[PDB]
DNA sequence: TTGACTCTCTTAAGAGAGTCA
DNA sequence: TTGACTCTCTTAAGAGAGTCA
């Protein structure tokens, strides 16, 4: 299939196209009561999206290039990582939004990690709130906090101990 | 079933039966370098499981009772919460294992909360490591830690800023 | 070769309901 | 009435592949 040089060319064309997406400034919690700023490069809400891009689901897109008469297609956020290993610890690598903004395709807002690691960032206290992720979070996770638990642990009788 | 007395009777029979499950001691990380001990009441691996209980999936069970000559059935971990609201902020309430042990049916190890709150406990630093859950965690989440990220945010050109 | 649609699948925290004996 | 099986569905973080012009 594609040589590593051809893969680099795909990454470069992807960056050139994404770099022309609308750039949206967002103020975000960092943890520790501090606020910061992220600049997201947001794919449009409806077609046309940009050269090579098409929507396969409500918040899913793919990037497609045809090379030597063969059509190649990738998940739209996976392209920055095409020269990296695609699994770790027996788990598939996934594109993980550090900005928690699905439409964003800024490669400086993405990392490449297991789906469990990816999901867990939703609850991280953030880079100024105690983040221990080795590839550090850019912001506090949107779901961090005390939660909204309706009922806690309880028993009616005396059959149980903790 | 319908009446509050009938619901109370269901909860009481469930507690009596689960109270006879084997009690298994598990030592657990609490965060902050500390360890604690939990006593889980574990449903058997194979039939018979206990009066009223049947397995509907590899780690899914249901509890069943006949009331007014009709069968009423519930997810096996939902029974303690039958007098509670079944939603919160428009999200379905779910049984959430504070001990992260699916076979356990100890109601002192369960709470009732949105699926997002439920999931997020997998990454909590724990009651001695910074848990902020209002209904406090019993242990550090099994997935807490630095992660195993294969590649971090990166660009080849100069089109992007954080 | 390209755009704009269509479809189903993965994961791991959770669910509801039917078929037999 | 009770037990022991069978099936598919929900969610929100993520995927692969087909059709037509
Ligand atoms: Na994510
Ligand atoms: Na859980
Ligand atoms: Zn972004
Ligand atoms: Zn983090
Ligand atoms: Zn337990
Ligand atoms: Zn917690």
**Length of chain A in residues, anyone?**
162
In which domain, by residue range, is A71 found?
Answer: 1-162
Judge if the upstream peptide bond of residue A27 is cis by omega within 30 degrees of 0.
no
Taking chain B, what is the end-to-end CA distance rounded to the nearest angstrom?
A: 56
Cα distance between residue A19 and residue B159, in whole Å: 5
Pick from A93, A97, A55, A58: nearest CA to A76: A55
CB of A101 nearer than 7 A to strand D: no
A33: exposed, middle or buried (Cβ count in 10 Å: 0-12, 13-18, 19+): exposed
Cα distance between residue B129 and residue B65, in whole Å: 42
Beta strands in chain A (DSSP E): 23-31, 34-41, 53-57, 60-67, 70-75, 87-88, 91-97, 110-114
The CATH number covering residue A72 comes to 3.90.75.10
Cα A151 to averaged position of ligand 4 atoms, centre (Å): 28
B118 part of the active site: yes
Q: Cβ contacts of residue B46 below 8 Å, gap of 6+?
A: none
Pick from A129, A132, A75, A121: nearest CA to A96: A121
- List, by residue number, the catalytic residues of A: 60, 97, 104, 118
Cα distance between residue B78 and residue B60, in whole Å: 12
Count CA atoms closer than 13 A to B134's CA, side-chain side.
11
Tokens representing A159 are: 């059959």
Cα distance between residue B8 and residue B80, in whole Å: 9
Cα distance between residue A74 and residue A1, in whole Å: 14
Is the CB of residue A115 less than 8 Å from the CB of residue A97?
A: no
Cα distance between residue B106 and residue A10, in whole Å: 54
Q: Active site residue: B104, B111, B124, B137, which one?
A: B104
Cα distance between residue B156 and residue B162, in whole Å: 14
Is the CB of residue A45 less than 8 Å from the CB of residue A102?
A: no
Sign of the CA dihedral B111, B17, A162, A132? negative
In total, how many domains does chain A have? Answer: 1
Cα A64 to averaged position of ligand 6 atoms, centre (Å): 42
Tokens representing B86 are: 């079944």
The full 3-state SS of chain B, as one line of letters, equals: CCCHHHHHHHHHHHHHHHCCCCEEEEEEEEECCEEEEEEEEECCCCCCCCCCEEEEECCEEEEEEEECCEEEEEECCCHHHCCCCCEECCEEEEEEECCCCCCECCHHHEEEEEHHHHHHHHHCCCCCCCCCCCCCCCCCCCCCCCCCCCECCCCCCCCCCC
Q: Please, what's the largest Cα pairwise distance for chain A?
A: 73
Task: Give, as one character, the DSSP assignment of residue A86.
Answer: S
Which technique was used to obtain these atomic coordinates? Answer: X-ray
B60 part of the active site: yes
CA distances from A69 to A1, A2, A51, A64, A124 (A): 12, 12, 18, 12, 45
Is the CB of residue A103 less than 8 Å from the CB of residue A43?
A: yes
Tokens representing B5 are: 């007395």
- Chain B residues touching A15 at Cβ < 8 A: 155-157, 159-160
A8 CA to chain B: closest CA distance, Å? 9
In A19-155, which residue ranges form alpha helices assigned H by DSSP? Answer: 115-120
Cα distance between residue B156 and residue A7, in whole Å: 12
Is the CB of residue A54 less than 8 Å from the CB of residue A61?
A: yes
Cα distance between residue B117 and residue B124, in whole Å: 11
Cα radius of gyration (chain A): 20
A10 CA – C2 C1', rounded, Å: 16
């Amino acid at each position: 299939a594609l040589t590593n040089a051809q893969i680099l060319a795909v990454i470069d064309s992807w960056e050139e196209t994404v770099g022309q997406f609308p750039v949206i400034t967002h103020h975000v919690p960092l943890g520790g009561g501090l606020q910061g700023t992220l600049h997201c490069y947001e794919i449009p809400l409806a077609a046309p999206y940009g050269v090579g891009f098409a929507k396969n689901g409500p918040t899913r897109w793919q990037y497609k290039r045809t090379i030597n008469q063969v059509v190649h297609r990738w998940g739209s956020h996976t392209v920055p990582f095409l020269l990296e290993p695609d699994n770790i610890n027996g788990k598939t690598c996934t594109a993980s939004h550090l900005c928690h903004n699905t439409r964003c395709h800024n490669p400086l807002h993405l990392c490449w990690e297991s789906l469990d690691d990816n999901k867990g960032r939703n609850w991280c206290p953030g880079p100024n709130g105690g983040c221990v992720h080795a590839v550090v979070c850019l912001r506090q996770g949107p779901l961090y906090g005390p939660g909204a638990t309706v009922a806690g642990p309880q028993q009616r009788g005396s059959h149980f101990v903790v």
